[PDB]
Amino acid sequence: PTFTERSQLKYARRLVVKLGSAVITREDNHGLALGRLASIVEQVAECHLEGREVMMVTSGAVAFGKQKLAQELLMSLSMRETLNEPRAAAAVGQSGLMSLYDAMFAQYGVKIAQVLVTKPDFYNEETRNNLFCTLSELISLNIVPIINTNDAVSPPPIKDNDSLSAMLAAEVQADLLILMSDVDGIYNKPPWEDGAKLMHTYTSDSKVKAATWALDRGVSVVICNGMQEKAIKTIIGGRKVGTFFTEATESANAVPVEVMAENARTGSRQMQALTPAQRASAVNTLADLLVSREKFILDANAKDLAEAQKSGLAKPLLSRLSLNPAKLKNLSVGLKQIAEDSHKNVGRVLRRTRLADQLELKQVTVPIGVLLVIFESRPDSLPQVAALAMASANGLLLKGGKEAAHSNKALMELVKEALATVGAEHAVSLVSTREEISDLLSMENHIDLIIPRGSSDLVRSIQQQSLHIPVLGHAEGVCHVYIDRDADLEKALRIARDAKCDYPAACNAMETLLIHEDLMSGAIFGDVCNMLKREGVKIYAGPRLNQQLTFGPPAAKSLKHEYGALECCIEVVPSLDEAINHIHTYGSSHTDVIVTENDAAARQFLGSVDSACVFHNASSRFADGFRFGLGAEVGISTARIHARGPVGVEGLLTTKWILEGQDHAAADFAEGGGRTWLHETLPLD
Amino acid sequence: PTFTERSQLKYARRLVVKLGSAVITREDNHGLALGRLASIVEQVAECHLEGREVMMVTSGAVAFGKQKLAQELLMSLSMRETLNEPRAAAAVGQSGLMSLYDAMFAQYGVKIAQVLVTKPDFYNEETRNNLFCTLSELISLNIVPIINTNDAVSPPPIKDNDSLSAMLAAEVQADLLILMSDVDGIYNKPPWEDGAKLMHTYTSDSKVKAATWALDRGVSVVICNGMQEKAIKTIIGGRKVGTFFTEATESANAVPVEVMAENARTGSRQMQALTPAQRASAVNTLADLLVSREKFILDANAKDLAEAQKSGLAKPLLSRLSLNPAKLKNLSVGLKQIAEDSHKNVGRVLRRTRLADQLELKQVTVPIGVLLVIFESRPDSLPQVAALAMASANGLLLKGGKEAAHSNKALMELVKEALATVGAEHAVSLVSTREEISDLLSMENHIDLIIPRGSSDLVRSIQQQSLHIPVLGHAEGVCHVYIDRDADLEKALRIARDAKCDYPAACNAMETLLIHEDLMSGAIFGDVCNMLKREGVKIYAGPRLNQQLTFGPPAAKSLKHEYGALECCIEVVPSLDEAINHIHTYGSSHTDVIVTENDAAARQFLGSVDSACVFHNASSRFADGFRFGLGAEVGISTARIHARGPVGVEGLLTTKWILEGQDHAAADFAEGGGRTWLHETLPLD
Amino acid sequence: TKPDFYNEETRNNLFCTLSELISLNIVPIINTNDAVSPPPIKDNDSLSAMLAAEVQADLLILMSDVDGIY
């Protein structure tokens, strides 16, 4: 079986389609699946005019024949009686079906040739070889030999069209093999069972038996879904459809998906009972080991970035690939601060209240569970997020990028060691090297939270891709600035300086500007535009300014665009309320800032604006959590739930209600029992 | 235009398909869209063998003709030169295409008849009438007259195949009209613009001009997507595809969708500045008005439930339709408690911390925004959830069921009045009466949170349906009970009593049981089974018990089933840890309870179990929030984020970071400026 | 094929099949499976004779090249 991977399909030369009887007929048994049939034939004529070697093996003649025979038998009775067989249908259907195929194909210039066979024809070797050389000749002549079994005179380990197709594919020595059947694939139990798990690849029934048999002779077998649209062009498209069949890539190559997740769940439950300074000691040891074997990891990083450099794929990426013992020291000290602050994050009380005699309760913090972080290779965060997990005592699934994968593996074994030290388990599992983002993205019930961290491309591709799963992270940092008629100019000057000039590539970086039109005449417009020129900032403009000015800067494509570089649209309005309108109209509710000296307008703004965060005489670059004294954050959430913007450690917990009644019961508290409600909010511990 | 609604399509008799040239050819311009063509023809033969009156109007002859002509022109040159027109292609394609259609149709018994026309043929009235009677005759004879324009000798408000189709449909006086075109529908601007809004129904360009023209003569026009699979059988299926065209159902009938949402957003922002006892006074007035006009609402409820009773659709539903001044008093007093407790839920500080000189911040509570509650008609919650909203000061979208819709309208006008009293706006909007759950379910960026409250059918249908939107509510209440070898029996007896017997129909009701096998020999098994018989409880069993006992109760279908009635699987294991395993294996992490007298095992359980809530010597029916002294809850969340189980008012807020710096800036705090981090946690206000 | 006449069961299946077809007002255009198994049946002619016998038909027409016999 030369081919082994669903990219290698691009290069199959000789392939053998095989349609099932379910494909041809409908459920009404009143015709054909003409749409499906002609679709298959169009795909085959395409993939053959390409140059490939293709030879269908049909089926379902008897169904068509039965339709025809029934109609005739109706049409041949006495009108009196109207007022109250394998071989026959076989032959009739064979004729009509060949005619139909022939018209359809000749619509594409190609030519066909019926070839009927029987079972004993395989037992005579000479017959077998005559058939073989015949088929090879036909194919060599650019012909599409539509094979079938001579059921018309001799109905039938060849016991079907399927085993037939297998034996053929072997003898013909073809590349591929497609059993376009009724069902869509394979599971470890019927759909009306437990374990509806698709066998997108198959390691190592009648269908499956033939699959085994043939696959043991050099062919590469597939099984698709007959009713699955654009089947063949997509299988050749390489995309994972149906149950591909190849040999094993066992855990020596990769644990498939889940065992990692469940191992992580288990170890999370383990460390759940390992609170008091256990994980603190763990992160202490981890920072130590980070500063103790950096030479190894420095050299791994150096070599891996040097390897990636020959590709030269992305200057931002290749620059983030920088790693030096300065960053190592920064990571170590941040992790030390994590160890410090992470003392009593978990298992902490929130409420203390009694309802009845000896009937108290509380609502206690608790890890979230299985976390899947995803990020372009910025390996500096790997130990960061690992420390976050092991402080929060929740498991963590890891999947970065192919870049720096070796350095990532180094960091991974580092942290795995440091955790196995105390924790009794590597309650963490990395996986990389072609981890089919969409697939595990679709998998549910084990993962909890998607944490994209790489860059805006990642978060976008996720949001558009992610479906039915808690995600995090913003989509784009379309910040907004407003300056009031009650604001000194140089303030706004240095403010816009720190705003745009500081790091235009940031996510939380400003990309717009809004000014009270009243003060437009105060030369401040010119001041700021000239300052932007001092920084060489591309300036766009909007309808209000274009109306206002004569020559002016160029226009703007769309108010809801982001640049990431020295480009910032600028608009101007009269009304603070109008500012509210515009912001809410375009802004991502991500960030905002007010520069003014009156609080009345300022506080009205603040109370009215619905950003993720608002400010006063400050900088959008303040949005880093670490700047908030929040400790090591994990990301920036614009989602309307559970967390806003700076997401520290607490954004990685939930609560759990616990109660200890004596013998209490619900109906007991009703008037039928001497039980009351107290709701005395006991002072939390 | 007799037909007006996408259910009425079931009854079209005479319809006129019309394919566009994009449908027939591919992009390679190297053949036909044989799959698409045969699919269309299969659909037409189906919908015609049904009995309908159908007559296609094709196009794209010239493309096919161009393919043929090019091939010929190649095949007719000197081999030397190979080493370095409307009408022609028109006629050739016409011939070949008619042949193809004919073979395809004759595959289904029907018969066709080419009919070519020209433009001037419509200007001669006699010609027009001859054509008309001819067509009527053909149709009457069960023939499928594939019309087309005589472009072969005379190429061309008839200026296309489209206007042609319109004029025909008018003259023929047909029911429907389908312009299966390239694009999928209509928006108020091109897709590469702003306003990609589908025109699923159209109120009141060349295509659109013809649509207007024809629709003004009694026909019902549609526009589908040529490449859209199973087009016609689905349009006839009635389902909303493409831009249906009918007359207006203006706001006098219904505001479409969004204006409600935006009105609500606005009014929410209004009431956002109306905190101090304003909304408290509002709910006071609302409870008053609830107790002041109940006679009106009692009679509306009575009449509406009497109307629904003639249907007799669901005893649980019809029983929940009960409404009486006792429930009215209960609602009023609960709303009074809401008024009481809802004082300072919103706009409250959470943190108080300074980072640098005059650089402080805080993180303040804030409404969530647009809430969409969905529920089978249990109108008792309408004022409940309304009070929740108006206490939380967040807007609310309402959509219940068709049942009690009039009583719901009564409650709606009640609360709308009470809100307009003070609040300056009806910051709330109901919508019911066929509100296309899936549609607004798909709409984003305005709604925030889906709150299903009706019953488990609703929450299920939602979860399976809901996509990319914050939802709430559990899926099923698969609770679990464990009794330990260190637990007195009668305790567990009364516990299981209150557990199952109290209300087996509850969501938070137990449906399983687990017991330490050690104590199985203590007759407690018999005690509880006999007690269940005293309550007539259907008893199932599992593998461990089936092994253990000889005759025993019947088995269980699936451990992950729910009953809602007197049915409860029962299993038995030795290990508390095994209990953990089984629970985590099947449980919805929804609820659990431990009855025992030793805390060591108990506390190990508690710390280890990952339910949404856990207990000790208590009842699963305790899970109501109101029982928790939590005040009026809204639902029960099993989602792993932001809220667990009992979701009070606080589960309807978020936070917002605010800052007031003096002139501070990010780069200012770097070593290049004399700024430091303080992170002094000021005592919160 | 040729061997199909040597198996009696095959012969009788073929026979009842043909009778059924004819009874159904169908025109069974017979031929020999020369496509996989080229060949007193040694032609289409002896074939036609054996058939006409087995089918028990009235007439038999061998429309051949020449016009007759001398």
JSON list of C-alpha atoms in Angstrom, two decimals, chain A residues 26 28 30-36 38-39 42 46 64 68 100 104 107-108 269 272 351 355 361 367-369 463 466-468 491 494-495 498 502 584 606-607 609-619 621-622 626-630 640-642 644 646 650 654-669 677 679, chain B residues 26 28 30-35 38-39 42 46 64 68 100 104 107-108 269 272 351 355 361 367-369 463 466-468 491 494-495 498 502 584 606-607 609-619 621-622 626-630 640-642 644 646 650 654-669 677 679:
[
{"chain": "A", "resi": 26, "resn": "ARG", "atom": "CA", "xyz": [-34.33, 6.25, -4.80]},
{"chain": "A", "resi": 28, "resn": "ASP", "atom": "CA", "xyz": [-39.67, 5.45, -3.93]},
{"chain": "A", "resi": 30, "resn": "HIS", "atom": "CA", "xyz": [-39.95, 4.62, -8.99]},
{"chain": "A", "resi": 31, "resn": "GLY", "atom": "CA", "xyz": [-36.86, 5.60, -10.98]},
{"chain": "A", "resi": 32, "resn": "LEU", "atom": "CA", "xyz": [-33.16, 6.28, -10.61]},
{"chain": "A", "resi": 33, "resn": "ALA", "atom": "CA", "xyz": [-31.04, 8.65, -8.58]},
{"chain": "A", "resi": 34, "resn": "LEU", "atom": "CA", "xyz": [-30.37, 10.52, -11.78]},
{"chain": "A", "resi": 35, "resn": "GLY", "atom": "CA", "xyz": [-28.90, 13.48, -9.95]},
{"chain": "A", "resi": 36, "resn": "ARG", "atom": "CA", "xyz": [-26.50, 11.29, -8.05]},
{"chain": "A", "resi": 38, "resn": "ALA", "atom": "CA", "xyz": [-24.88, 12.06, -13.34]},
{"chain": "A", "resi": 39, "resn": "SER", "atom": "CA", "xyz": [-22.91, 13.71, -10.57]},
{"chain": "A", "resi": 42, "resn": "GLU", "atom": "CA", "xyz": [-19.34, 14.13, -14.21]},
{"chain": "A", "resi": 46, "resn": "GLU", "atom": "CA", "xyz": [-13.33, 15.18, -14.93]},
{"chain": "A", "resi": 64, "resn": "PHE", "atom": "CA", "xyz": [-33.88, -0.78, -12.51]},
{"chain": "A", "resi": 68, "resn": "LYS", "atom": "CA", "xyz": [-39.23, -1.84, -15.93]},
{"chain": "A", "resi": 100, "resn": "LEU", "atom": "CA", "xyz": [-27.90, 5.56, -19.90]},
{"chain": "A", "resi": 104, "resn": "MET", "atom": "CA", "xyz": [-24.08, 10.44, -20.29]},
{"chain": "A", "resi": 107, "resn": "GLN", "atom": "CA", "xyz": [-21.76, 13.83, -23.50]},
{"chain": "A", "resi": 108, "resn": "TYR", "atom": "CA", "xyz": [-18.10, 14.24, -22.48]},
{"chain": "A", "resi": 269, "resn": "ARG", "atom": "CA", "xyz": [-8.57, 15.80, 39.80]},
{"chain": "A", "resi": 272, "resn": "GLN", "atom": "CA", "xyz": [-7.22, 19.20, 43.02]},
{"chain": "A", "resi": 351, "resn": "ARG", "atom": "CA", "xyz": [-20.59, 32.69, 50.67]},
{"chain": "A", "resi": 355, "resn": "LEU", "atom": "CA", "xyz": [-31.03, 28.45, 56.02]},
{"chain": "A", "resi": 361, "resn": "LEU", "atom": "CA", "xyz": [-24.01, 26.00, 52.87]},
{"chain": "A", "resi": 367, "resn": "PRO", "atom": "CA", "xyz": [-10.97, 24.68, 38.64]},
{"chain": "A", "resi": 368, "resn": "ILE", "atom": "CA", "xyz": [-12.60, 24.67, 35.25]},
{"chain": "A", "resi": 369, "resn": "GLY", "atom": "CA", "xyz": [-10.97, 21.51, 33.92]},
{"chain": "A", "resi": 463, "resn": "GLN", "atom": "CA", "xyz": [-14.18, 32.47, 15.72]},
{"chain": "A", "resi": 466, "resn": "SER", "atom": "CA", "xyz": [-15.03, 27.55, 16.33]},
{"chain": "A", "resi": 467, "resn": "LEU", "atom": "CA", "xyz": [-18.54, 26.23, 16.87]},
{"chain": "A", "resi": 468, "resn": "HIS", "atom": "CA", "xyz": [-20.35, 25.29, 20.07]},
{"chain": "A", "resi": 491, "resn": "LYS", "atom": "CA", "xyz": [-1.97, 66.29, 27.17]},
{"chain": "A", "resi": 494, "resn": "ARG", "atom": "CA", "xyz": [1.62, 62.99, 24.50]},
{"chain": "A", "resi": 495, "resn": "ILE", "atom": "CA", "xyz": [-1.46, 60.80, 24.85]},
{"chain": "A", "resi": 498, "resn": "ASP", "atom": "CA", "xyz": [1.88, 56.85, 23.80]},
{"chain": "A", "resi": 502, "resn": "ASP", "atom": "CA", "xyz": [4.34, 53.19, 21.37]},
{"chain": "A", "resi": 584, "resn": "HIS", "atom": "CA", "xyz": [-21.12, 51.73, 19.83]},
{"chain": "A", "resi": 606, "resn": "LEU", "atom": "CA", "xyz": [-17.93, 56.54, 31.62]},
{"chain": "A", "resi": 607, "resn": "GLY", "atom": "CA", "xyz": [-21.30, 55.47, 32.94]},
{"chain": "A", "resi": 609, "resn": "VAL", "atom": "CA", "xyz": [-19.90, 53.92, 27.37]},
{"chain": "A", "resi": 610, "resn": "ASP", "atom": "CA", "xyz": [-19.98, 50.13, 27.08]},
{"chain": "A", "resi": 611, "resn": "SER", "atom": "CA", "xyz": [-16.36, 49.34, 26.33]},
{"chain": "A", "resi": 612, "resn": "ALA", "atom": "CA", "xyz": [-14.55, 46.43, 27.87]},
{"chain": "A", "resi": 613, "resn": "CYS", "atom": "CA", "xyz": [-12.50, 49.10, 29.65]},
{"chain": "A", "resi": 614, "resn": "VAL", "atom": "CA", "xyz": [-12.45, 52.88, 29.88]},
{"chain": "A", "resi": 615, "resn": "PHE", "atom": "CA", "xyz": [-9.92, 55.39, 31.09]},
{"chain": "A", "resi": 616, "resn": "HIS", "atom": "CA", "xyz": [-9.18, 59.03, 31.81]},
{"chain": "A", "resi": 617, "resn": "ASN", "atom": "CA", "xyz": [-5.92, 60.69, 30.75]},
{"chain": "A", "resi": 618, "resn": "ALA", "atom": "CA", "xyz": [-4.27, 57.31, 30.20]},
{"chain": "A", "resi": 619, "resn": "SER", "atom": "CA", "xyz": [-3.11, 55.04, 27.38]},
{"chain": "A", "resi": 621, "resn": "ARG", "atom": "CA", "xyz": [-1.34, 50.35, 26.05]},
{"chain": "A", "resi": 622, "resn": "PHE", "atom": "CA", "xyz": [-2.21, 50.19, 29.74]},
{"chain": "A", "resi": 626, "resn": "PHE", "atom": "CA", "xyz": [0.28, 43.02, 34.46]},
{"chain": "A", "resi": 627, "resn": "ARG", "atom": "CA", "xyz": [0.06, 46.80, 34.33]},
{"chain": "A", "resi": 628, "resn": "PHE", "atom": "CA", "xyz": [-3.15, 46.46, 36.34]},
{"chain": "A", "resi": 629, "resn": "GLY", "atom": "CA", "xyz": [-1.22, 44.75, 39.10]},
{"chain": "A", "resi": 630, "resn": "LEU", "atom": "CA", "xyz": [-3.30, 41.72, 38.13]},
{"chain": "A", "resi": 640, "resn": "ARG", "atom": "CA", "xyz": [-19.82, 39.48, 26.97]},
{"chain": "A", "resi": 641, "resn": "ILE", "atom": "CA", "xyz": [-19.65, 36.70, 29.55]},
{"chain": "A", "resi": 642, "resn": "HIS", "atom": "CA", "xyz": [-17.65, 35.73, 32.60]},
{"chain": "A", "resi": 644, "resn": "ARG", "atom": "CA", "xyz": [-13.78, 41.28, 30.34]},
{"chain": "A", "resi": 646, "resn": "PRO", "atom": "CA", "xyz": [-7.70, 41.63, 31.31]},
{"chain": "A", "resi": 650, "resn": "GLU", "atom": "CA", "xyz": [-9.58, 34.22, 38.60]},
{"chain": "A", "resi": 654, "resn": "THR", "atom": "CA", "xyz": [-15.91, 28.57, 38.79]},
{"chain": "A", "resi": 655, "resn": "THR", "atom": "CA", "xyz": [-17.95, 27.82, 41.89]},
{"chain": "A", "resi": 656, "resn": "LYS", "atom": "CA", "xyz": [-19.63, 24.78, 43.36]},
{"chain": "A", "resi": 657, "resn": "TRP", "atom": "CA", "xyz": [-22.52, 24.73, 45.82]},
{"chain": "A", "resi": 658, "resn": "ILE", "atom": "CA", "xyz": [-22.05, 22.49, 48.83]},
{"chain": "A", "resi": 659, "resn": "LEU", "atom": "CA", "xyz": [-24.45, 21.84, 51.69]},
{"chain": "A", "resi": 660, "resn": "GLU", "atom": "CA", "xyz": [-24.40, 19.92, 54.95]},
{"chain": "A", "resi": 661, "resn": "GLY", "atom": "CA", "xyz": [-27.87, 19.29, 56.30]},
{"chain": "A", "resi": 662, "resn": "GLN", "atom": "CA", "xyz": [-28.50, 17.06, 59.29]},
{"chain": "A", "resi": 663, "resn": "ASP", "atom": "CA", "xyz": [-31.44, 15.07, 57.93]},
{"chain": "A", "resi": 664, "resn": "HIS", "atom": "CA", "xyz": [-33.27, 17.90, 56.20]},
{"chain": "A", "resi": 665, "resn": "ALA", "atom": "CA", "xyz": [-35.55, 17.44, 53.21]},
{"chain": "A", "resi": 666, "resn": "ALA", "atom": "CA", "xyz": [-37.47, 19.72, 50.88]},
{"chain": "A", "resi": 667, "resn": "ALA", "atom": "CA", "xyz": [-41.01, 18.73, 51.88]},
{"chain": "A", "resi": 668, "resn": "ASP", "atom": "CA", "xyz": [-39.81, 18.90, 55.48]},
{"chain": "A", "resi": 669, "resn": "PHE", "atom": "CA", "xyz": [-39.39, 22.66, 55.16]},
{"chain": "A", "resi": 677, "resn": "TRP", "atom": "CA", "xyz": [-35.62, 29.75, 56.17]},
{"chain": "A", "resi": 679, "resn": "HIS", "atom": "CA", "xyz": [-30.67, 33.08, 55.09]},
{"chain": "B", "resi": 26, "resn": "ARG", "atom": "CA", "xyz": [-19.07, 24.92, -15.42]},
{"chain": "B", "resi": 28, "resn": "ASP", "atom": "CA", "xyz": [-13.86, 25.41, -17.02]},
{"chain": "B", "resi": 30, "resn": "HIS", "atom": "CA", "xyz": [-15.23, 22.45, -20.99]},
{"chain": "B", "resi": 31, "resn": "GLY", "atom": "CA", "xyz": [-18.63, 20.77, -20.67]},
{"chain": "B", "resi": 32, "resn": "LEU", "atom": "CA", "xyz": [-21.93, 21.01, -18.84]},
{"chain": "B", "resi": 33, "resn": "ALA", "atom": "CA", "xyz": [-23.02, 21.01, -15.23]},
{"chain": "B", "resi": 34, "resn": "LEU", "atom": "CA", "xyz": [-24.38, 17.55, -15.83]},
{"chain": "B", "resi": 35, "resn": "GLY", "atom": "CA", "xyz": [-24.84, 16.90, -12.13]},
{"chain": "B", "resi": 38, "resn": "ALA", "atom": "CA", "xyz": [-29.84, 16.07, -14.12]},
{"chain": "B", "resi": 39, "resn": "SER", "atom": "CA", "xyz": [-30.66, 17.07, -10.56]},
{"chain": "B", "resi": 42, "resn": "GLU", "atom": "CA", "xyz": [-35.07, 14.70, -11.57]},
{"chain": "B", "resi": 46, "resn": "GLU", "atom": "CA", "xyz": [-40.84, 14.22, -9.50]},
{"chain": "B", "resi": 64, "resn": "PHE", "atom": "CA", "xyz": [-22.72, 24.61, -25.20]},
{"chain": "B", "resi": 68, "resn": "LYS", "atom": "CA", "xyz": [-18.83, 22.31, -29.79]},
{"chain": "B", "resi": 100, "resn": "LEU", "atom": "CA", "xyz": [-29.80, 15.75, -23.83]},
{"chain": "B", "resi": 104, "resn": "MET", "atom": "CA", "xyz": [-32.91, 12.50, -19.54]},
{"chain": "B", "resi": 107, "resn": "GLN", "atom": "CA", "xyz": [-35.64, 8.17, -18.58]},
{"chain": "B", "resi": 108, "resn": "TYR", "atom": "CA", "xyz": [-38.73, 9.05, -16.53]},
{"chain": "B", "resi": 269, "resn": "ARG", "atom": "CA", "xyz": [-28.71, 52.36, 28.14]},
{"chain": "B", "resi": 272, "resn": "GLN", "atom": "CA", "xyz": [-28.58, 52.35, 33.02]},
{"chain": "B", "resi": 351, "resn": "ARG", "atom": "CA", "xyz": [-11.92, 46.40, 43.33]},
{"chain": "B", "resi": 355, "resn": "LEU", "atom": "CA", "xyz": [-0.98, 51.79, 40.73]},
{"chain": "B", "resi": 361, "resn": "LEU", "atom": "CA", "xyz": [-8.88, 52.23, 39.10]},
{"chain": "B", "resi": 367, "resn": "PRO", "atom": "CA", "xyz": [-25.66, 44.95, 32.82]},
{"chain": "B", "resi": 368, "resn": "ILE", "atom": "CA", "xyz": [-25.16, 42.40, 30.11]},
{"chain": "B", "resi": 369, "resn": "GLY", "atom": "CA", "xyz": [-27.50, 43.93, 27.54]},
{"chain": "B", "resi": 463, "resn": "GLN", "atom": "CA", "xyz": [-28.58, 23.13, 22.28]},
{"chain": "B", "resi": 466, "resn": "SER", "atom": "CA", "xyz": [-28.21, 26.92, 19.01]},
{"chain": "B", "resi": 467, "resn": "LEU", "atom": "CA", "xyz": [-24.90, 27.79, 17.38]},
{"chain": "B", "resi": 468, "resn": "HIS", "atom": "CA", "xyz": [-22.34, 30.44, 18.28]},
{"chain": "B", "resi": 491, "resn": "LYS", "atom": "CA", "xyz": [-32.36, 8.64, 56.92]},
{"chain": "B", "resi": 494, "resn": "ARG", "atom": "CA", "xyz": [-36.98, 9.58, 53.97]},
{"chain": "B", "resi": 495, "resn": "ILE", "atom": "CA", "xyz": [-34.24, 10.98, 51.74]},
{"chain": "B", "resi": 498, "resn": "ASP", "atom": "CA", "xyz": [-38.21, 13.48, 49.33]},
{"chain": "B", "resi": 502, "resn": "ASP", "atom": "CA", "xyz": [-41.74, 14.70, 45.95]},
{"chain": "B", "resi": 584, "resn": "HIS", "atom": "CA", "xyz": [-18.34, 11.44, 36.23]},
{"chain": "B", "resi": 606, "resn": "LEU", "atom": "CA", "xyz": [-17.17, 16.61, 48.23]},
{"chain": "B", "resi": 607, "resn": "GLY", "atom": "CA", "xyz": [-13.73, 17.86, 47.33]},
{"chain": "B", "resi": 609, "resn": "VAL", "atom": "CA", "xyz": [-16.94, 15.27, 43.04]},
{"chain": "B", "resi": 610, "resn": "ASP", "atom": "CA", "xyz": [-17.42, 17.74, 40.20]},
{"chain": "B", "resi": 611, "resn": "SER", "atom": "CA", "xyz": [-21.18, 18.25, 40.25]},
{"chain": "B", "resi": 612, "resn": "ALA", "atom": "CA", "xyz": [-22.78, 21.61, 39.79]},
{"chain": "B", "resi": 613, "resn": "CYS", "atom": "CA", "xyz": [-23.84, 21.21, 43.42]},
{"chain": "B", "resi": 614, "resn": "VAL", "atom": "CA", "xyz": [-23.34, 18.70, 46.22]},
{"chain": "B", "resi": 615, "resn": "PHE", "atom": "CA", "xyz": [-25.05, 18.08, 49.51]},
{"chain": "B", "resi": 616, "resn": "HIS", "atom": "CA", "xyz": [-25.07, 16.09, 52.73]},
{"chain": "B", "resi": 617, "resn": "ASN", "atom": "CA", "xyz": [-28.26, 14.59, 54.17]},
{"chain": "B", "resi": 618, "resn": "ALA", "atom": "CA", "xyz": [-30.41, 16.81, 51.97]},
{"chain": "B", "resi": 619, "resn": "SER", "atom": "CA", "xyz": [-32.64, 16.62, 48.90]},
{"chain": "B", "resi": 621, "resn": "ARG", "atom": "CA", "xyz": [-35.31, 19.24, 45.31]},
{"chain": "B", "resi": 622, "resn": "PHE", "atom": "CA", "xyz": [-33.40, 21.80, 47.36]},
{"chain": "B", "resi": 626, "resn": "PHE", "atom": "CA", "xyz": [-35.24, 30.48, 46.21]},
{"chain": "B", "resi": 627, "resn": "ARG", "atom": "CA", "xyz": [-34.59, 27.68, 48.68]},
{"chain": "B", "resi": 628, "resn": "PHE", "atom": "CA", "xyz": [-30.99, 28.91, 48.79]},
{"chain": "B", "resi": 629, "resn": "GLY", "atom": "CA", "xyz": [-32.19, 32.29, 49.99]},
{"chain": "B", "resi": 630, "resn": "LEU", "atom": "CA", "xyz": [-30.90, 33.49, 46.63]},
{"chain": "B", "resi": 640, "resn": "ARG", "atom": "CA", "xyz": [-18.96, 25.24, 32.78]},
{"chain": "B", "resi": 641, "resn": "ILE", "atom": "CA", "xyz": [-18.70, 29.02, 32.60]},
{"chain": "B", "resi": 642, "resn": "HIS", "atom": "CA", "xyz": [-19.78, 32.08, 34.52]},
{"chain": "B", "resi": 644, "resn": "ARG", "atom": "CA", "xyz": [-23.42, 27.07, 38.06]},
{"chain": "B", "resi": 646, "resn": "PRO", "atom": "CA", "xyz": [-28.82, 28.27, 40.78]},
{"chain": "B", "resi": 650, "resn": "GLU", "atom": "CA", "xyz": [-25.78, 38.33, 39.83]},
{"chain": "B", "resi": 654, "resn": "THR", "atom": "CA", "xyz": [-20.46, 41.67, 34.12]},
{"chain": "B", "resi": 655, "resn": "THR", "atom": "CA", "xyz": [-17.70, 44.10, 35.01]},
{"chain": "B", "resi": 656, "resn": "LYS", "atom": "CA", "xyz": [-16.05, 47.06, 33.36]},
{"chain": "B", "resi": 657, "resn": "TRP", "atom": "CA", "xyz": [-12.58, 48.44, 34.06]},
{"chain": "B", "resi": 658, "resn": "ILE", "atom": "CA", "xyz": [-12.40, 52.17, 34.62]},
{"chain": "B", "resi": 659, "resn": "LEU", "atom": "CA", "xyz": [-9.35, 54.31, 35.30]},
{"chain": "B", "resi": 660, "resn": "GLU", "atom": "CA", "xyz": [-8.66, 57.95, 36.12]},
{"chain": "B", "resi": 661, "resn": "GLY", "atom": "CA", "xyz": [-5.05, 58.88, 35.52]},
{"chain": "B", "resi": 662, "resn": "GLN", "atom": "CA", "xyz": [-3.83, 62.45, 35.73]},
{"chain": "B", "resi": 663, "resn": "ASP", "atom": "CA", "xyz": [-1.72, 62.55, 32.58]},
{"chain": "B", "resi": 664, "resn": "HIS", "atom": "CA", "xyz": [-0.16, 59.11, 32.85]},
{"chain": "B", "resi": 665, "resn": "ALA", "atom": "CA", "xyz": [1.04, 57.08, 29.89]},
{"chain": "B", "resi": 666, "resn": "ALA", "atom": "CA", "xyz": [2.44, 53.59, 29.37]},
{"chain": "B", "resi": 667, "resn": "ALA", "atom": "CA", "xyz": [5.96, 54.54, 28.26]},
{"chain": "B", "resi": 668, "resn": "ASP", "atom": "CA", "xyz": [5.93, 57.08, 31.10]},
{"chain": "B", "resi": 669, "resn": "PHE", "atom": "CA", "xyz": [5.92, 54.24, 33.62]},
{"chain": "B", "resi": 677, "resn": "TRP", "atom": "CA", "xyz": [3.56, 50.40, 40.35]},
{"chain": "B", "resi": 679, "resn": "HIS", "atom": "CA", "xyz": [-1.02, 47.91, 43.45]}
]
